[PDB]
Design a protein around this ligand. Structure first.
Ligand code: NDU
Ligand code: NDU
Lengths: 264, 264
């Protein structure tokens, strides 16, 4: 996508050399924002093939409040394996905070239901927020949430969403994060009887791994194809009742996949 | 300031009419980002006079973890009066969350010290964050934090900071929020022996009150003057040992003040 390739070029042109915790260098910029009109099409990167199957399953898993990879395994989704312990536990990561944020007084807050209530009963609210950044539980998480904080917004029958992503691997992480939040906006809009508006992506440390220079050059040579169209085949009675087969992507014609290897 | 006046014009040109909880209309946009190179000067709005005295005292009060207005009163700062109860209590707002975020296991997390540790011992960290968005304590706050979440970043001996502000009154609130965070970046840089980099402001619902049309037109007619220079007169031994008189602003020559009235 146009916005994505401009970010990619901007990191190459403007990134400063920064070490990360792996020891691999990165090229890094701090602070960037992009916007996707969801009425223009589903924002799935076309300049390299992205397997949507994993994105969907992960999102459904988040919404269940599940932090054990067992569900992902039933479906042969392995994207969380490197972080899981022998039991398949990740600690209180994303889904746990979305659905069951623990308070000092013994409650567990369902942030997803809260947001649905607000969208339905107080759509002009400037407080419609989900946070995964639970300071008291960070130590226990396999890793700190990258996509940390998001806000919904309703104007003119349109649902928009802004994500604050503290840390972003532009090559491996970003394509997947944008699709995942766009899908969530579509499910939220469906459940609230609203139209989709904008997805606004905001980045903190937004970086390319230094061993991804060739892959980045390769991708930047490719021309974006038209965006696909997301189809939702049914309206469940709840945001928690979606199933994998409810979603269809139409018109997706990507350039071939690019493998990007990682250091250990 | 240039960036500020462009935001102001952009809300007028692009804002949609949105009601708020007061009942006053707003003109609102969702998602905006601006950047201030702090080496170019202190970002205090010149196209209307801003009284820095209040900004400073409020910031020192935040850093104390104090949520009772008593300290502000000793100094005849009244900006929090409309929200305080008869005892002068605000509930567990900003300062309480910065200095003493309560965990379910009975701890209180000092996020300011945490950030200082990281800046000194692990400056490449992509997790150097302070959040005021404590989901379990929102109900008890006089109001939900507007400036909710911020991230620090170190590259090339320069300290940058990004603020996510969920809700922003462009006329009354914003000038004051930018100065307050720029001052914090200067104090943090001083304590960590770093140079100042960028302050990146990111907005959610960014709005002008509909009864501020005349004041906005007036201000937009004015030409920005050069930015002032911040002077810190001493280096305290701790981020908690700053005093009002440690700060001086040099070269500040603003156009006259503009009063903006509010509905009740
Ligand atoms: O969804 C995600 N998107 C991402 O881009 N990441 C990336 C950003 C970083 O390159 C890395 C996390 O490392 P730290 O930022 O050091 O925690 O993983 C994180 C990630 N995740 O852990 O789920
Ligand atoms: O620092 C601040 N900056 C701001 O711009 N505000 C503004 C944004 C809104 O116009 C209003 C808060 O109302 P809600 O967004 O409805 O909570 O107050 C909030 C504020 N504060 O409460 O400290």
């Amino acid at each position: 996508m146009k916005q994505y390739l401009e970010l990619m070029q901007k990191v190459l042109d403007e990134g400063t050399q920064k070490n990360d915790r792996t020891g691999t260098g990165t090229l890094s910029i701090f602070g960037h924002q992009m916007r996707f009109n969801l009425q223009d099409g589903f924002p799935l990167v076309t300049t390299k093939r992205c397997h949507l199957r994993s994105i969907i399953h992960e999102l459904l898993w988040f919404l269940q409040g599940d932090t054990n990879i067992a569900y992902l395994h039933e479906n042969n989704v392995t994207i969380w394996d490197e972080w899981a312990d022998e039991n398949g536990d990740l600690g209180p990561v994303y889904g746990k905070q979305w659905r069951a944020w623990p308070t000092p007084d013994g409650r567990h807050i369902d942030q997803i239901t809260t947001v649905l209530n607000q969208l339905k009963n107080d759509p002009d609210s400037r407080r419609i927020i989900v946070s995964a950044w639970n300071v008291g539980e960070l130590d226990k998480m396999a890793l700190a949430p990258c996509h940390a904080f998001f806000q919904f917004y309703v104007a003119d029958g349109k649902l928009s969403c802004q994500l604050y992503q503290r840390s972003c691997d532009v090559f491996l992480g970003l394509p997947f994060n944008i699709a995942s939040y766009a899908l969530l906006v579509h499910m939220m809009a469906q459940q609230c009887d609203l139209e989709v508006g904008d997805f606004v992506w905001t980045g903190g440390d937004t970086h390319l791994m230094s061993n991804h220079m060739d892959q980045t050059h390769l991708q930047l040579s490719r021309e974006p194809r038209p965006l696909p169209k997301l189809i939702i085949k049914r309206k469940p009675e709840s945001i928690f009742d979606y199933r994998f087969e409810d979603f269809e992507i139409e018109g997706y014609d990507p350039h071939p996949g690019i493998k990007a290897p990682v250091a250990i």
